[PDB]
Amino acid sequence: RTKPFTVPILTVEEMTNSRFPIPLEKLFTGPSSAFVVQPQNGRCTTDGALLGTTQLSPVDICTFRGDVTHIAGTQNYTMNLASQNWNNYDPTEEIPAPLGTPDFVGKIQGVLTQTTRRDGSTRGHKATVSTGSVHFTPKLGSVQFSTDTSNDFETGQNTRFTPVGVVQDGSTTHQNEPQQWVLPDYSGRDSHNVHLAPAVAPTFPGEQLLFFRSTMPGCSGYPNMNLDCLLPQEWVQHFYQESAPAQSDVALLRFVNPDTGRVLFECKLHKSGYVTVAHTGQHDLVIPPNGYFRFDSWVNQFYTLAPMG
Amino acid sequence: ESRTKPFTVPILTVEEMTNSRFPIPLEKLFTGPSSAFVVQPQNGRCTTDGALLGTTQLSPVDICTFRGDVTHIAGTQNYTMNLASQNWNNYDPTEEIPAPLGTPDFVGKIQGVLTQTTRRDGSTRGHKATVSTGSVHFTPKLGSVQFSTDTSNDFETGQNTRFTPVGVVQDGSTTHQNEPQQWVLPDYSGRDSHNVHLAPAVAPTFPGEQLLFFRSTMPGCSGYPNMNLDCLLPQEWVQHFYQESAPAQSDVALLRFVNPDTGRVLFECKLHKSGYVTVAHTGQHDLVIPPNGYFRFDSWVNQFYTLAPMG
Numbered sequence: 001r002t003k004p005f006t007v008p009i010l011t012v013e014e015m016t017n018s019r020f021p022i023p024l025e026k027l028f029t030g031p032s033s034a035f036v037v038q039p040q041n042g043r044c045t046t047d048g049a050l051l052g053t054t055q056l057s058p059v060d061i062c063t064f065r066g067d068v069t070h071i072a073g074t075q076n077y078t079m080n081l082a083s084q085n086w087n088n089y090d091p092t093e094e095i096p097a098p099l100g101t102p103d104f105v106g107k108i109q110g111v112l113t114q115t116t117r118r119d120g121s122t123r124g125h126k127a128t129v130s131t132g133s134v135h136f137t138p139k140l141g142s143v144q145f146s147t148d149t150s151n152d153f154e155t156g157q158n159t160r161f162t163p164v165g166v167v168q169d170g171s172t173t174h175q176n177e178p179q180q181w182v183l184p185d186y187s188g189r190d191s192h193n194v195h196l197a198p199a200v201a202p203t204f205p206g207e208q209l210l211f212f213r214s215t216m217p218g219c220s221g222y223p224n225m226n227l228d229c230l231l232p233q234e235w236v237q238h239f240y241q242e243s244a245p246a247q248s249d250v251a252l253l254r255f256v257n258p259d260t261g262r263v264l265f266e267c268k269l270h271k272s273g274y275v276t277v278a279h280t281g282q283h284d285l286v287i288p289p290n291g292y293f294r295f296d297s298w299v300n301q302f303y304t305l306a307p308m309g
Numbered sequence: 310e311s312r313t314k315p316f317t318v319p320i321l322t323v324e325e326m327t328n329s330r331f332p333i334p335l336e337k338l339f340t341g342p343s344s345a346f347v348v349q350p351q352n353g354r355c356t357t358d359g360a361l362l363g364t365t366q367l368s369p370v371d372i373c374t375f376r377g378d379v380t381h382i383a384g385t386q387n388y389t390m391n392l393a394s395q396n397w398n399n400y401d402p403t404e405e406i407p408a409p410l411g412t413p414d415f416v417g418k419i420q421g422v423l424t425q426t427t428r429r430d431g432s433t434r435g436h437k438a439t440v441s442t443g444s445v446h447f448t449p450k451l452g453s454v455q456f457s458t459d460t461s462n463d464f465e466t467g468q469n470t471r472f473t474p475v476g477v478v479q480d481g482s483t484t485h486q487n488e489p490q491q492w493v494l495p496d497y498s499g500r501d502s503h504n505v506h507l508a509p510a511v512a513p514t515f516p517g518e519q520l521l522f523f524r525s526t527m528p529g530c531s532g533y534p535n536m537n538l539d540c541l542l543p544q545e546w547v548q549h550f551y552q553e554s555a556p557a558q559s560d561v562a563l564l565r566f567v568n569p570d571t572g573r574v575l576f577e578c579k580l581h582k583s584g585y586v587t588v589a590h591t592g593q594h595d596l597v598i599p600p601n602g603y604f605r606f607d608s609w610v611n612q613f614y615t616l617a618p619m620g
């Protein structure tokens with residue numbers, strides 16, 4: 001028959017957040033009609049099509065490579081983006097932004113590094129990229145960093161940003177940023193994002209999205225550190241390898257505790273890449289650390305889940 | 310002879326894959342003699358049938374990281390970190406592995422950032438920090454490691470602290486490229502205590518044959534450091550082998566590196582059961598590959614198999 005569908009046998013803690021390069025920590029559910037769930041990283045159909053700005057590398061998420069140019073009279077640099085392999089980035093490719101581009105509005109702190117080609121000399125400096133900034137225009141091929149130097153980086157040299165965590169301004173409302181559910185303007189002010197992966201939503205009574213949650217490192221302030229993704233990076237990687245044809249609307253998963261051998265809850269993995277559970281309210285799931293997801297069968301949308309604990 | 314689930318390697322091009330000794334992408338394939346040095350990395354070690362070895366674990370982002378609580382050292386800019394595990398539980402020094410899974414497997418100074426959150430009010434701080442793995446204070450297998458930084462009063466005690474690696478450093482007024490030293494193991498328990506539970510040293514033992522290395526270029530943050538980093542298995546292969554666990558029918562898996570456009574086979578190589586790759590070649594060589602090529606398992610062969618010379 002057709003190639004059988006599967007999800008990785010991996011506990012939540014062995015897996016990686018698909019929207020920022022750190023491990024998953026937990027499963028969280030809550031109502032989502034008050035915000036727009038349209039992330040562009042961590043988007044993949046169950047049969048293996050990548051969507052949005054999603055790519056395979058768990059470490060190249062929220063990274064940037066290119067050449068930098070000082071902005072006279074400031075401590076900021078403009079980076080002209082190059083591709084993941086140092087090729088030119090093409091703005092006309094039909095994606096929202098370079099694959100891996102961050103998909104939330106926030107200030108991401110990380111380190112800008114550079115080797116000088118003629119001698120192998122090296123430099124590294126603290127740098128922030130502000131994704132809601134008017135100069136965040138990855139889709140046009142350009143992004144801007146604020147740093148703690150003014151003369152160190154050289155023009156025409158390979159430069160790389162490594163993300164570390166996020167930042168918020170402490171004299172304003174605690175946890176007011178980042179805003180994990182607002183996409184940046186990939187092309188700047190007054191321009192529409194294009195080729196986005198579809199916003200998603202529960203579409204059955206009783207049901208809520210299930211999120212795979214990490215905590216972002218915080219570098220300064222009182223940032224909102226929560227980061228929910230719709231698929232672990234390892235699942236994206238798996239669906240891409242397997243390419244199993246979806247046989248109905250939903251793949252029914254069981255989350256099992258191997259110590260008791262008992263199913264703890266079931267959920268729906270929709271064909272176009274996210275999960276729902278039967279629950280009303282915000283809930284941090286309590287799970288055994290060695291619990292894992294296993295595919296059960298392909299069922300219709302109208303399948304009724306047993307209430308999640 | 311044996312009716313079991315067929316062994317395979319991920320269908321991924323070199324550039325789609327991740328280095329298994331530092332969290333960055335693979336760049337290229339490289340081969341060369343290695344009798345002058347000891348090849349014994351402890352990350353990116355895994356058997357073809359799924360047995361993680363050394364200090365190797367599954368996460369591509371958790372290599373070279375560290376978690377724990379920190380403690381200031383009076384009159385310096387250094388902190389001592391007590392390590393916890395990947396889940397914030399206590400490091401168990403008696404677990405039978407050489408050091409906490411993911412610990413750096415080479416001698417060098419890795420620069421990165423130490424971050425912290427205060428549990429009770431959500432406040433956060435982050436500072437530039439370097440860990441020197443050759444230092445007498447590098448004792449991860451004893452639960453402890455040390456960081457140099459640019460602050461003496463910011464980090465709190467008793468609070469969750471995290472180190473994200475970024476790159477490596479070297480002192481410019483000394484011999485260029487003299488560090489890091491990617492083939493020297495740290496002393497995991499410090500001086501005057503031996504390394505234990507190591508994944509074994511590897512060597513091509515077949516006439517005409519060399520190791521095939523998966524190579525990246527670590528970011529340099531200062532000076533003239535040696536930025537090459539070679540690993541024996543891409544992280545995605547370690548991940549695949551652990552998941553699949555396909556039984557080995559011999560000690561050697563024959564792989565062909567294929568160009569899927571044309572169907573043509575570029576070269577063939579041995580993927581040994583214990584976990585590294587060899588090719589038939591003499592001399593240092595940067596492989597030239599079509600950017601969409603990928604590896605394909607073709608069959609199990611015996612001890613006596615001679616590989617077609619690699620370009």
Ligand SMILES: CC(=O)N[C@H]1[C@@H](O[C@H]2[C@@H](O)[C@@H](CO)O[C@@H](O)[C@@H]2O[C@@H]2O[C@@H](C)[C@@H](O)[C@@H](O)[C@@H]2O)O[C@H](CO)[C@H](O)[C@@H]1O
Binds near residue numbers: 171221222
């Ligand atoms: C980004 C930066 O310059 N950080 C240094 C600075 O940290 C404080 C300032 O950034 C300040 C701006 O006027 O905002 C403060 O909130 C911030 O403090 C940081 O966040 C608070 C809640 C605490 O968690 C602090 O530990 C943390 O630094 O100045 C401090 C002086 O202690 C450091 O130099 C930072 O490197």
Ligand SMILES: CC(=O)N[C@H]1[C@@H](O[C@H]2[C@@H](O)[C@@H](CO)O[C@@H](O)[C@@H]2O[C@@H]2O[C@@H](C)[C@@H](O)[C@@H](O)[C@@H]2O)O[C@H](CO)[C@H](O)[C@@H]1O
Binds near residue numbers: 124478531
């Ligand atoms: C790690 C660190 O503190 N780096 C800063 C420091 O870098 C210079 C010093 O480390 C100096 C020792 O007295 O050695 C210099 O070589 C080094 O410069 C670094 O390497 C040279 C070859 C160039 O590539 C530089 O771009 C690079 O920084 O001091 C410099 C001075 O500008 C910077 O602050 C570094 O952040």
